[PDB]
Amino acid sequence: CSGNLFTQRTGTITSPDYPNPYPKSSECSYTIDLEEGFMVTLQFEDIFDIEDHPEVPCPYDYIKIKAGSKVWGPFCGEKSPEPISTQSHSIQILFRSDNSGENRGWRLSYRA
Amino acid sequence: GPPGPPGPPGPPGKLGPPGPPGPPGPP
Amino acid sequence: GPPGPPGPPGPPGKLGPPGPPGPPGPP
Amino acid sequence: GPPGPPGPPGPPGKLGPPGPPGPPGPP
Ligand SMILES: [Ca+2]
């Protein structure tokens, strides 16, 4: 589930197999790559369900976002983070899952 | 007829996350 | 008759393992 | 009726204990 590339000004990205549960032991990568000057916003939509833990932030499965030297996350749980204004035109999204659990995953739209 | 008895208890929960790293050494 | 209802949840997972050593202390 | 389905996995384990203190620094 790596090398997913999005080059249109707007689009939709999901965890593998969404809206069904994502696969175990996944290390997925997604790239949004736009021309210079564009500034991408990421906004989650629909159900957001990434395995979490009640005491510790995201120790099992997580989504992380990187743009240049900027890093957001990790994120997990039953509620998506607030929309992310990346202020950037080229973004990498990483999604890791461990070897157990049944959770639905995530869906986001991006725009610039 | 009547419903059967409860199923068996499920499998144990998954292992806890590893503990945090220790603190820095003494001076 | 109909199947019984699902069993109770399994037992809580095991305590996580100890963390790794801390980094080196100060000079 | 027959017994029900097994129950769901239990809750996750607790966070592990902290790791040991790091090695000492420069003297
Ligand atoms: Ca998982």
Report the CATH number at residue A32.
Answer: 2.60.120.290
Determine how many CB atoms are found less than 10 A away from the CB of residue D1. 12
Q: Which residues does A102 contact at the CB level (< 8 Å), separation at least 6?
A: A21
CA distance A27 to B16: 21
CA of A61 to the centre of ligand 1 (A): 5
Chain C to chain D Cβ contacts (< 8 Å): 85
Q: What value does the CA radius of gyration of chain A take, rounded to a whole number of Å?
A: 13
Select from C4, C19, C24 the Cβ nearest to the Cβ of D23: C24
Structural domains counted in chain A: 1
Structure tokens at D16: 């592990």
Q: How far is D15 from chain A (nearest CA, A)?
A: 7
* A36: DSSP letter: T
Touching D: A residues 77-106, CB under 8 Å:
100
CA distance D5 to D25: 57
Determine how many CB atoms are found less than 10 A away from the CB of residue B2. 8
Task: Give the burial class of A30: count Cβ atoms within 10 A of its Cβ; 0-12 exposed, 13-18 middle, 19 or more buried.
Answer: buried
Exposure class string for A83-103: b at 16+ Cβ within 10 A, else e: ebebebbbbebbbbbeebbeb
CA distance A90 to A102: 31
Structural resolution in Å: 1.8
Q: Which positions in chain C touch B12 (Cβ < 8 Å)?
A: 10-14
Strands A4-6, A41-44: pairing kind: unpaired
Query: CA A35 → CA A22, A32, A49, A60, A79, distances in Å?
Result: 31, 10, 32, 35, 31
Touching A: B residues 1-27, CB under 8 Å:
14, 17-18
CB of B22 closer than 8 Å to CB of C18: no
Q: Is A54 in contact with D15 (Cβ distance < 8 A)?
A: no
Domain region containing A112? 1-112
| Amino acid, res. A24 | K
Phi-psi region of A37 (alpha: psi -120 to 50; beta: other; left: phi over 0): left
Structure tokens at A106: 């995530």
Determine how many CB atoms are found less than 10 A away from the CB of residue A76. 25
Annotated binding site of A for Ca(2+): 51, 61, 98, 100
CB of B17 closer than 8 Å to CB of C14: no
Closest by alpha carbon to A96, among A64, A66, A69? A64
